[PDB]
PDB file of C-alpha atoms and ligand atoms in Angstrom:
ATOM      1  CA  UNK I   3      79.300 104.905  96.583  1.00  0.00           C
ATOM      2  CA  UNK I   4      82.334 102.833  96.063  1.00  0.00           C
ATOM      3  CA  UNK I   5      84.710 101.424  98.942  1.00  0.00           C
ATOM      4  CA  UNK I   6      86.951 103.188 100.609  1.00  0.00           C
ATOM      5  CA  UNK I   7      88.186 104.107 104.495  1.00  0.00           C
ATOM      6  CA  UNK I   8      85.571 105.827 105.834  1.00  0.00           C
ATOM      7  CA  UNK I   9      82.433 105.565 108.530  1.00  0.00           C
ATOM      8  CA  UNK I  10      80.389 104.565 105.649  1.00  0.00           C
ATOM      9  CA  UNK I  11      82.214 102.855 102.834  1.00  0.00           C
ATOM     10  CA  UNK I  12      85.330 101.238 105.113  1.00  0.00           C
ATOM     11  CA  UNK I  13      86.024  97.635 106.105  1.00  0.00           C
ATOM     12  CA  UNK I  14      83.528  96.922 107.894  1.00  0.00           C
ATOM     13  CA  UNK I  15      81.300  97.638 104.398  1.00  0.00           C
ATOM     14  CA  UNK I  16      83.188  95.541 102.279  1.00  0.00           C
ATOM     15  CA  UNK I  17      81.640  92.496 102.429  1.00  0.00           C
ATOM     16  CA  UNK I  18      78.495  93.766 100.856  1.00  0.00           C
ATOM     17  CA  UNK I  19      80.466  94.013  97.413  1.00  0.00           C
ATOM     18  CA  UNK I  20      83.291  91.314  98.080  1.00  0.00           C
ATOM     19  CA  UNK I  21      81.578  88.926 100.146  1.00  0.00           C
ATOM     20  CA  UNK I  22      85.246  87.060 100.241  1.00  0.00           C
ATOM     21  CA  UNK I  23      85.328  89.966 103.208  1.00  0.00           C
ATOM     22  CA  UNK I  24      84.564  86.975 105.346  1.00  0.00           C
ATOM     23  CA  UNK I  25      86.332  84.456 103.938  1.00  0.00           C
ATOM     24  CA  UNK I  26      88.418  81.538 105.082  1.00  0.00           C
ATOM     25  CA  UNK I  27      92.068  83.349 104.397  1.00  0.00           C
ATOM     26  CA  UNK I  28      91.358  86.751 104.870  1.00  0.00           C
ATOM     27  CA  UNK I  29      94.074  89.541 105.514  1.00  0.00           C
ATOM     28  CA  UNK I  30      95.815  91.560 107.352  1.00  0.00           C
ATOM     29  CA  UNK I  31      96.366  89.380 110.457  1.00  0.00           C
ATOM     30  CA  UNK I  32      97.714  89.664 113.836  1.00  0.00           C
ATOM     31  CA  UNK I  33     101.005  87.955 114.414  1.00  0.00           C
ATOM     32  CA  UNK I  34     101.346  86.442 117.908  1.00  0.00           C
ATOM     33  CA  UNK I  35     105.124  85.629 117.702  1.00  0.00           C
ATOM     34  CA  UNK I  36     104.949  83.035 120.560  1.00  0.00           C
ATOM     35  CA  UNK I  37     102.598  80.543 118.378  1.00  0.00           C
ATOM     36  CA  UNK I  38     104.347  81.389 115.231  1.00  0.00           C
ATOM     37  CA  UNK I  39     106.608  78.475 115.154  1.00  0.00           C
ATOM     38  CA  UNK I  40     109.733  78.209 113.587  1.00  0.00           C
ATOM     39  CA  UNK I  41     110.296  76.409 110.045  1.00  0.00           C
ATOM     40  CA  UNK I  42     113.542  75.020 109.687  1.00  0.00           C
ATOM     41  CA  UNK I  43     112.731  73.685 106.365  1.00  0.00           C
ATOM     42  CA  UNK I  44     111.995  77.081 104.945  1.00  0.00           C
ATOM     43  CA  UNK I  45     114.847  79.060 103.086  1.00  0.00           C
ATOM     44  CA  UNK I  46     116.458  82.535 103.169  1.00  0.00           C
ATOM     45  CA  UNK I  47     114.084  84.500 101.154  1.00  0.00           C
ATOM     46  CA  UNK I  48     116.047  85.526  97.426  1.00  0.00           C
ATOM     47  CA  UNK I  49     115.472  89.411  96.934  1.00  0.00           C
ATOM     48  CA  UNK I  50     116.433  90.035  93.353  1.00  0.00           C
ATOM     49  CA  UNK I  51     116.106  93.902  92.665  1.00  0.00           C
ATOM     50  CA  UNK I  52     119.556  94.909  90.774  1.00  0.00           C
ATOM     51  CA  UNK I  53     117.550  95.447  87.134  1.00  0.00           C
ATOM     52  CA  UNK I  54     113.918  97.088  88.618  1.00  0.00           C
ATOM     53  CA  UNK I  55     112.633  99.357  86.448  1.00  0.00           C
ATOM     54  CA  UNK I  56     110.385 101.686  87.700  1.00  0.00           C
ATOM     55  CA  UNK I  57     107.798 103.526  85.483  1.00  0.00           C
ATOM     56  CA  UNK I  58     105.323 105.943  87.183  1.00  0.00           C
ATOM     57  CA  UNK I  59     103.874 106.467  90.302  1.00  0.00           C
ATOM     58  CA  UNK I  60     100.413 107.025  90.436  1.00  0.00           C
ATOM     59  CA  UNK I  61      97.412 108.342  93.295  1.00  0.00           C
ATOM     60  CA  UNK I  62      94.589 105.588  93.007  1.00  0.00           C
ATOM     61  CA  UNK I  63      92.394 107.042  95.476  1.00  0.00           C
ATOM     62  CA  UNK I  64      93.431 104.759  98.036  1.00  0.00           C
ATOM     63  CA  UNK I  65      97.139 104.954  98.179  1.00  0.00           C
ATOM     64  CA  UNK I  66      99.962 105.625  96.076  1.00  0.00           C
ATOM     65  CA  UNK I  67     101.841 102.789  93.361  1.00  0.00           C
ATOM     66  CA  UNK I  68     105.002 102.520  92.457  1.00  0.00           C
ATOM     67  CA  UNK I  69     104.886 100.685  89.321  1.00  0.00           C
ATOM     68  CA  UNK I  70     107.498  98.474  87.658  1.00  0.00           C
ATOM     69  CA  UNK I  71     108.305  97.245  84.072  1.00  0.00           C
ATOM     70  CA  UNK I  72     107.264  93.701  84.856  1.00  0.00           C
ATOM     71  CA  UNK I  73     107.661  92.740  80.698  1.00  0.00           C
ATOM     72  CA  UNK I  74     110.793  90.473  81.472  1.00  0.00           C
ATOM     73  CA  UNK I  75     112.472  88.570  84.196  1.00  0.00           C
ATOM     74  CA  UNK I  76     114.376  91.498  86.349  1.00  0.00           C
ATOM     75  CA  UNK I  77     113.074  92.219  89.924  1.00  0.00           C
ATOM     76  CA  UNK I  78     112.045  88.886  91.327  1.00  0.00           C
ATOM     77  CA  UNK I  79     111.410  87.196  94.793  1.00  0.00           C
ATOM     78  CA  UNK I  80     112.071  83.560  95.132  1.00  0.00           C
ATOM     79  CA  UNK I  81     112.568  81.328  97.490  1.00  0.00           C
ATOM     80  CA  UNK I  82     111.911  81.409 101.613  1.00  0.00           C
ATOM     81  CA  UNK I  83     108.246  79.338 101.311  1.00  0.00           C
ATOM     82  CA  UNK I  84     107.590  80.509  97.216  1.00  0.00           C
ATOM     83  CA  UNK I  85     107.941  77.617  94.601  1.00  0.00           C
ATOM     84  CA  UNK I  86     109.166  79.264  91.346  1.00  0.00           C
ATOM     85  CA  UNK I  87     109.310  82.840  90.847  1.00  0.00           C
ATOM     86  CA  UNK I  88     107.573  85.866  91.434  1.00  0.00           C
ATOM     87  CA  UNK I  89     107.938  89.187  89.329  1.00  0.00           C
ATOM     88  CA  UNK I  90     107.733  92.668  91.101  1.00  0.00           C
ATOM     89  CA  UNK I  91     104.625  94.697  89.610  1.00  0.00           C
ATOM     90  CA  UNK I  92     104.440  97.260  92.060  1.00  0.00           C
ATOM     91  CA  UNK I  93     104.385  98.637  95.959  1.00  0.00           C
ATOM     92  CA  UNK I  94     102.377 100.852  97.741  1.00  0.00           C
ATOM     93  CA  UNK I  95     101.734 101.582 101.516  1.00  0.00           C
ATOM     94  CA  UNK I  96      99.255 101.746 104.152  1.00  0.00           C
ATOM     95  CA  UNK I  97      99.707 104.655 106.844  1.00  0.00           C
ATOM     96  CA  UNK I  98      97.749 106.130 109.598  1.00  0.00           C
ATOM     97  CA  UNK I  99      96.526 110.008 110.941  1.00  0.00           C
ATOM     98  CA  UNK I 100      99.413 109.188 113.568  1.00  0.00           C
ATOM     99  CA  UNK I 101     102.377 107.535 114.631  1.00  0.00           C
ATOM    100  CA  UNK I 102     100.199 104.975 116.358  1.00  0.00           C
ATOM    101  CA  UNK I 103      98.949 102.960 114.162  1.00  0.00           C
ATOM    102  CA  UNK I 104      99.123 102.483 110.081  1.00  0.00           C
ATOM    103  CA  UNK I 105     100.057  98.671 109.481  1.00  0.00           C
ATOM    104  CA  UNK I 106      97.918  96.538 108.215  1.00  0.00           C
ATOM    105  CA  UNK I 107      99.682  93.739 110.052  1.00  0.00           C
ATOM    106  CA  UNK I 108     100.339  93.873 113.564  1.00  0.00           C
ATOM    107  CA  UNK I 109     102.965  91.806 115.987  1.00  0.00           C
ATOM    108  CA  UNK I 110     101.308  91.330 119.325  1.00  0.00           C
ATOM    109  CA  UNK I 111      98.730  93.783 119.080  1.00  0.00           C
ATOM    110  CA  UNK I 112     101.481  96.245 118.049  1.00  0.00           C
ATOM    111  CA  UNK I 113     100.299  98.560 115.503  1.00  0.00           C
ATOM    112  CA  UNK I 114     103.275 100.349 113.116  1.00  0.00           C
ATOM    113  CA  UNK I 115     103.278 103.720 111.761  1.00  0.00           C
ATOM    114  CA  UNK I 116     102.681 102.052 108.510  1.00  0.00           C
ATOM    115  CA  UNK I 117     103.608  99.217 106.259  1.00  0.00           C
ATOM    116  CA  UNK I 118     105.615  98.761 102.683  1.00  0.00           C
ATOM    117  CA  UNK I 119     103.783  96.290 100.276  1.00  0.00           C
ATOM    118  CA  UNK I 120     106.314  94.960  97.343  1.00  0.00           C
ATOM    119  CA  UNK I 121     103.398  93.288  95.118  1.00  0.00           C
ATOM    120  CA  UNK I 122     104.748  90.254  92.706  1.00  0.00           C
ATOM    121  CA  UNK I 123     103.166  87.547  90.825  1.00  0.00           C
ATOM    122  CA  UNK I 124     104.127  84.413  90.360  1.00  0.00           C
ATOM    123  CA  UNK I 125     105.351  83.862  86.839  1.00  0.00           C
ATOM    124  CA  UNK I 126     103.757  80.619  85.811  1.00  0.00           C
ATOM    125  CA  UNK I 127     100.394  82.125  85.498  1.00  0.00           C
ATOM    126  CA  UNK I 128     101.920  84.515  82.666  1.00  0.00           C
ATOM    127  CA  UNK I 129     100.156  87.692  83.836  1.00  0.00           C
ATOM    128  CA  UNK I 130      99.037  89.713  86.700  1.00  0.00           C
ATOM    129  CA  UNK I 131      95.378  89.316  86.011  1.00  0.00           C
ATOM    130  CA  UNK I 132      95.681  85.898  85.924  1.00  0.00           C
ATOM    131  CA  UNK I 133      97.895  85.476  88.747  1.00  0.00           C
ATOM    132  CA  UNK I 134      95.293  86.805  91.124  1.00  0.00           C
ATOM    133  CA  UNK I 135      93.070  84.103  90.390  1.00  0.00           C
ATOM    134  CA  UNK I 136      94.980  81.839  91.716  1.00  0.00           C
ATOM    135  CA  UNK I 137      95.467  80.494  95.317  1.00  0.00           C
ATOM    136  CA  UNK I 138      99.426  80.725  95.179  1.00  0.00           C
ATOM    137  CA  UNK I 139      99.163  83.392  92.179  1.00  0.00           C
ATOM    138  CA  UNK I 140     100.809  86.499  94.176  1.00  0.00           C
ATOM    139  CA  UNK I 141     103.357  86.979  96.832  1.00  0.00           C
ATOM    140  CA  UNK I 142     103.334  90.166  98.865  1.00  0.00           C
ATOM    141  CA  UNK I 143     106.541  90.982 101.484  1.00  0.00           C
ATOM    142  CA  UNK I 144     105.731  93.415 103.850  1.00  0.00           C
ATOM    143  CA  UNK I 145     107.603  96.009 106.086  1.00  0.00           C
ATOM    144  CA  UNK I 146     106.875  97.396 108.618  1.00  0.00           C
ATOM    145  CA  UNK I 147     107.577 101.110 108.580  1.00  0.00           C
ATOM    146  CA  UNK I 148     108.548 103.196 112.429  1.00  0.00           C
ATOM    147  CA  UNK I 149     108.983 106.651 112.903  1.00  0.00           C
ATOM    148  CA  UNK I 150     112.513 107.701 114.036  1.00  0.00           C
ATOM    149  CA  UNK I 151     115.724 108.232 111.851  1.00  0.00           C
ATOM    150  CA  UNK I 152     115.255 109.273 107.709  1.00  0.00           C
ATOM    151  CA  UNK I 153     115.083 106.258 105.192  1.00  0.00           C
ATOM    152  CA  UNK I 154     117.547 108.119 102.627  1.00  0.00           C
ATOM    153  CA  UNK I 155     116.049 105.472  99.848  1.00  0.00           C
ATOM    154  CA  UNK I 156     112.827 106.906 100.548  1.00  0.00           C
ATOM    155  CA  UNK I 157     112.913 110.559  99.979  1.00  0.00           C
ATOM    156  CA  UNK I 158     112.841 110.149  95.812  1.00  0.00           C
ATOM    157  CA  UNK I 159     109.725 108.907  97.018  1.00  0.00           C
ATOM    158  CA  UNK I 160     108.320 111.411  99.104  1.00  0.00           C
ATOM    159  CA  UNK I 161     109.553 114.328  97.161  1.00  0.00           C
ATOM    160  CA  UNK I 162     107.256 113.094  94.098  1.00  0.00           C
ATOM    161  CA  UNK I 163     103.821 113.182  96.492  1.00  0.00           C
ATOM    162  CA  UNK I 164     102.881 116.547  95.472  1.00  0.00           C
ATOM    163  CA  UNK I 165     102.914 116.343  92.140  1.00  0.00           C
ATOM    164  CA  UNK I 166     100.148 113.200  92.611  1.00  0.00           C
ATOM    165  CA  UNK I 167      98.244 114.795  95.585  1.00  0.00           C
ATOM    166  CA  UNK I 168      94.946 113.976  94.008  1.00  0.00           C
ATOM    167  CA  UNK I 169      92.983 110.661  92.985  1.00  0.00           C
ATOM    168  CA  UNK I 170      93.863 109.837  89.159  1.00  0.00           C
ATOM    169  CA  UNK I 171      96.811 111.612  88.927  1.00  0.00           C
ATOM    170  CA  UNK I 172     100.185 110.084  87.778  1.00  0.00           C
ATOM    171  CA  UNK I 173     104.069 110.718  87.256  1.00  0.00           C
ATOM    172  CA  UNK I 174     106.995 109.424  85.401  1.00  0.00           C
ATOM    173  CA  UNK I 175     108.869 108.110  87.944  1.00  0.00           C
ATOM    174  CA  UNK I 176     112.355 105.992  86.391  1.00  0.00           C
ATOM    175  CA  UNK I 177     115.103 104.765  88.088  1.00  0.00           C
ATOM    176  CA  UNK I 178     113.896 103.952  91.479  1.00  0.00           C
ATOM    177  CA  UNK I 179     115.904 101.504  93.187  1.00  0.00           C
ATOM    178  CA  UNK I 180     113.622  99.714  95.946  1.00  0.00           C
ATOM    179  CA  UNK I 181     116.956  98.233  97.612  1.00  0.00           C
ATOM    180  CA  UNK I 182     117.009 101.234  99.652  1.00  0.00           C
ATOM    181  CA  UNK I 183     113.550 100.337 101.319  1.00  0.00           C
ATOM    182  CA  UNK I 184     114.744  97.087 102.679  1.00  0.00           C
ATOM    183  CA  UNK I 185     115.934  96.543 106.306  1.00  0.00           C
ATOM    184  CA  UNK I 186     119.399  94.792 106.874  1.00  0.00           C
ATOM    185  CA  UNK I 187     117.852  91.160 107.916  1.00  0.00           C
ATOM    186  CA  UNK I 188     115.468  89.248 105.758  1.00  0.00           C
ATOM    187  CA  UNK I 189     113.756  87.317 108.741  1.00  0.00           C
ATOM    188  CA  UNK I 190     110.068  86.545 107.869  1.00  0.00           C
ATOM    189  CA  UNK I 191     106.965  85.343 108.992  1.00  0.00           C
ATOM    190  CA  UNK I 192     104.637  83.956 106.477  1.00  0.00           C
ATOM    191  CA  UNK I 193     101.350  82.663 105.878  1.00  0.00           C
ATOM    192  CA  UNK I 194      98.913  82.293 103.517  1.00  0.00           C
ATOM    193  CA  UNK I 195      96.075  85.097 102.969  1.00  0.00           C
ATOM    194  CA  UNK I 196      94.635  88.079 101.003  1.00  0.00           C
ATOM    195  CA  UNK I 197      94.629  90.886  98.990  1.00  0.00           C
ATOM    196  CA  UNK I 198      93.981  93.482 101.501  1.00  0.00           C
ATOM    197  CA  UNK I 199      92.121  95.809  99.361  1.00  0.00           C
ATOM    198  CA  UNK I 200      88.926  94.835  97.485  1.00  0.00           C
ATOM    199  CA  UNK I 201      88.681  92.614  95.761  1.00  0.00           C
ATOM    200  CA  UNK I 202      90.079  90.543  98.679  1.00  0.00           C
ATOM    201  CA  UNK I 203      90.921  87.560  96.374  1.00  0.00           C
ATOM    202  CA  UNK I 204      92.313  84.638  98.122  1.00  0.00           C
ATOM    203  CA  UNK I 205      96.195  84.387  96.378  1.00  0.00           C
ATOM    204  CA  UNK I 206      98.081  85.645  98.118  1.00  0.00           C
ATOM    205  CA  UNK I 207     101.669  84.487  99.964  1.00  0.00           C
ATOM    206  CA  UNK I 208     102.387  86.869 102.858  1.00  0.00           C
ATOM    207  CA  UNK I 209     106.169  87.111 103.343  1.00  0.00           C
ATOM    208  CA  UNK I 210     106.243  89.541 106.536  1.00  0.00           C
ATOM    209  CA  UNK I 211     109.806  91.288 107.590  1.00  0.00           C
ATOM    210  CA  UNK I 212     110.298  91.222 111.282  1.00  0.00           C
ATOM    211  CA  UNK I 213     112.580  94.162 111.025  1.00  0.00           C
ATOM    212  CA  UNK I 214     110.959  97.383 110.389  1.00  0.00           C
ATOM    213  CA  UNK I 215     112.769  99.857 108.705  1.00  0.00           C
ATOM    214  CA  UNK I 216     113.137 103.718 109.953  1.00  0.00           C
ATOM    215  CA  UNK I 217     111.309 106.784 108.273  1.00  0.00           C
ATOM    216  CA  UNK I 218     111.209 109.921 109.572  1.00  0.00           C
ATOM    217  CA  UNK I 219     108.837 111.898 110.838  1.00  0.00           C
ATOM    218  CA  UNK I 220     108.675 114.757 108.063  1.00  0.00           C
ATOM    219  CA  UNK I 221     108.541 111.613 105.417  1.00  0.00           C
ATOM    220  CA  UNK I 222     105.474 110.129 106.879  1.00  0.00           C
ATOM    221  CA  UNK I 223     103.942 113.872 107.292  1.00  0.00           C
ATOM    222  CA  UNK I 224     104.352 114.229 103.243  1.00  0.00           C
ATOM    223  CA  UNK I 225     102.318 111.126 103.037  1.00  0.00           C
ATOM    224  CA  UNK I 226      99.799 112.337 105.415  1.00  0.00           C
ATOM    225  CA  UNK I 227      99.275 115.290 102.740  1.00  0.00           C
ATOM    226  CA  UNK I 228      97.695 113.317  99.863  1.00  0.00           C
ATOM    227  CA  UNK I 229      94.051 113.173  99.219  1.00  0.00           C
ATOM    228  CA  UNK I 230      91.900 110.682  98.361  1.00  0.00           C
ATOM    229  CA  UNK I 231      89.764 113.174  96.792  1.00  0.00           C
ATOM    230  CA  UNK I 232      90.158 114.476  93.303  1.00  0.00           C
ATOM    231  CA  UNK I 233      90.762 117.442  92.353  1.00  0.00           C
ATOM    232  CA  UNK I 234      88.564 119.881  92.390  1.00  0.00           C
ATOM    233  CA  UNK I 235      87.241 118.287  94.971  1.00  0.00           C
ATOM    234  CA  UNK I 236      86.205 118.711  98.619  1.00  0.00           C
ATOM    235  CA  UNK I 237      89.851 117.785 100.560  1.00  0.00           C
ATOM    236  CA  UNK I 238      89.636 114.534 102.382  1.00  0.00           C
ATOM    237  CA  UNK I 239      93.276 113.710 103.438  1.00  0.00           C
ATOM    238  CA  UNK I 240      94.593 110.505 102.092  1.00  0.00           C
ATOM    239  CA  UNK I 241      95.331 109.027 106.112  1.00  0.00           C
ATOM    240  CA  UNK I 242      94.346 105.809 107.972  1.00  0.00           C
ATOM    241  CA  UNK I 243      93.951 103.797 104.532  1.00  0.00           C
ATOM    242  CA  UNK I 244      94.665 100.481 106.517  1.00  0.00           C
ATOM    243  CA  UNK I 245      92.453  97.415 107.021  1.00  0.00           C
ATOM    244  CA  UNK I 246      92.455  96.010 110.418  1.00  0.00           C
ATOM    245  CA  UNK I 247      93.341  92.170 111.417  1.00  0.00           C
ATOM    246  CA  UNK I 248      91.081  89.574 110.665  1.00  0.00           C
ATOM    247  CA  UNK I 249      90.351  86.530 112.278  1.00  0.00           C
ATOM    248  CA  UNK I 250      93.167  83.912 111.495  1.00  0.00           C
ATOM    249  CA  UNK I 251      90.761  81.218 111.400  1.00  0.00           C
ATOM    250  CA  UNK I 252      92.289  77.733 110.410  1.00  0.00           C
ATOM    251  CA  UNK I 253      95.536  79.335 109.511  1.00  0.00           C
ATOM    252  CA  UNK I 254      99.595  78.735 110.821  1.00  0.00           C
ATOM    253  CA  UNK I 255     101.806  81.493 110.901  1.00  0.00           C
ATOM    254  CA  UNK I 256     105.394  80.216 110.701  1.00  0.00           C
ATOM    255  CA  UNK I 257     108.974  81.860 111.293  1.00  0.00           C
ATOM    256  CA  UNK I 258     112.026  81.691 109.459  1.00  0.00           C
ATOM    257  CA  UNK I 259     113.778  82.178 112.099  1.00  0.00           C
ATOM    258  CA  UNK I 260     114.712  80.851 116.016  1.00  0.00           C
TER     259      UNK I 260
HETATM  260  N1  LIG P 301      97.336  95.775  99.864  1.00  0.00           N
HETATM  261  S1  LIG P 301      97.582  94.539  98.922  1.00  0.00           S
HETATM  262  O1  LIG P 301      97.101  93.220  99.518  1.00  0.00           O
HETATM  263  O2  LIG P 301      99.076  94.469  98.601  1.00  0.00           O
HETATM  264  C1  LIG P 301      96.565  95.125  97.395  1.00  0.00           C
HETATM  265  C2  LIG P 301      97.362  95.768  96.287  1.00  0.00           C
HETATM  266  C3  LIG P 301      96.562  96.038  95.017  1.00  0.00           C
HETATM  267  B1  LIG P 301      97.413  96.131  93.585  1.00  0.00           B
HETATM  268  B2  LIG P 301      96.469  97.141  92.489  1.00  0.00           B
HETATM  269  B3  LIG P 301      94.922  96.316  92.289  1.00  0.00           B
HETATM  270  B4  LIG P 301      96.370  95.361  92.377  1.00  0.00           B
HETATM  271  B5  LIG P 301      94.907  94.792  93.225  1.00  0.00           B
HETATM  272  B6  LIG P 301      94.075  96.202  93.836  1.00  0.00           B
HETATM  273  B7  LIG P 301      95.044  97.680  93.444  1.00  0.00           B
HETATM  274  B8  LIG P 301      96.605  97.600  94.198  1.00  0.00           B
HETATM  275  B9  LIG P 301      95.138  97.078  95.036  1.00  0.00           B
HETATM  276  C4  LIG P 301      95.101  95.307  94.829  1.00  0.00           C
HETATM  277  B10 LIG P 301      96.470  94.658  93.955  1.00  0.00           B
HETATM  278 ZN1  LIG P 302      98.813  96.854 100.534  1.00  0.00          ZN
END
């Protein structure tokens, strides 16, 4: 009986495992962009992608990861509120049963289709695992995901998902460039929180993208087609894997922008 998304093992069950559930900086959170207040001493955000080298992709269950050779210096995020430098380890998304909601995040109560989480860790802590144990050990930028016109950059992507349709399954997967899931503008939001997966752990550096990019309607369908099941097993389809806000308790959001 392990955690999942459902009536019986979903967020509102975590806690019982991961007390942290409840916790002080706790994510997803709503984003009410009239309190957020603008930051003019934070900088552009630095977006370093050129070398990524993706590995595999792999069905955990709960969503699917892109993961990254993160044995050197090559895809890093710096800058906008980080100190030092983070290393890109992997992303995955969040996505609902339909258009209407997905995110994990929401922006006055709006719900996305679904959201894009680019996963680093901050390099002075040497490794991943150790990185998480740490209050300013990861930062995650998120984006937002609507339904409309194709993201081109995403259809390697897609196109892969039934090979992994099933929990434990895995696929080479080289040579993905994740420039082509980024909007144009690099405004953020940003505030500290979560993992928002068990085990919850408190290191995380939010970096939020107010500019969703476009997917179609066929791509998110293909996601909507994986199952969290294995195989062999009875079909549950891999939809509505998204945590809902939590309370922002004694937290600031704040904007890089005007
Ligand atoms: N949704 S999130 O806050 O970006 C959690 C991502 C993950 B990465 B892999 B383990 B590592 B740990 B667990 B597994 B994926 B979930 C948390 B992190
Ligand atoms: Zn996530």
């Amino acid at each position: 009986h392990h955690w999942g998304y459902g009536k019986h093992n979903g967020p509102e069950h975590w806690h019982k495992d991961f007390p942290i559930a409840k916790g002080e900086r706790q994510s997803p959170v709503d984003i009410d962009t009239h309190t957020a207040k603008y930051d003019p001493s934070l900088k552009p955000l630095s977006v370093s992608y050129d070398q990524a080298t993706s590995l595999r992709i792999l069905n955990n269950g709960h969503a699917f990861n892109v993961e990254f050779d993160d044995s050197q210096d090559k895809a890093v995020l710096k800058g906008g509120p980080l100190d030092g430098t983070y290393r890109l380890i992997q992303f995955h998304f969040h996505w609902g049963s339909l258009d209407g909601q997905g995110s994990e995040h929401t922006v006055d109560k709006k719900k996305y289709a679904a959201e894009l989480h680019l996963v680093h860790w901050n390099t002075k802590y040497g490794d991943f695992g150790k990185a998480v144990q740490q209050p300013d050990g990861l930062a995650v930028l998120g984006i937002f995901l609507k339904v409309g016109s194709a993201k081109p950059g995403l259809q390697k992507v897609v196109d892969v998902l039934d090979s992994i349709k099933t929990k434990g399954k895995s696929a080479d997967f080289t040579n993905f460039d994740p420039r082509g899931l980024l909007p144009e503008s690099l405004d953020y939001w940003t505030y500290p929180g979560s993992l928002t997966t068990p085990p919850l752990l408190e290191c995380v550096t939010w970096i939020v993208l107010k500019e969703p990019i476009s997917v179609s309607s066929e791509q998110v369908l293909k996601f909507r087609k994986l199952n969290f099941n294995g195989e062999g097993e009875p079909e549950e389809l891999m939809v509505d894997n998204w945590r809902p806000a939590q309370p922002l308790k004694n937290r600031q959001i704040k904007a890089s922008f005007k």
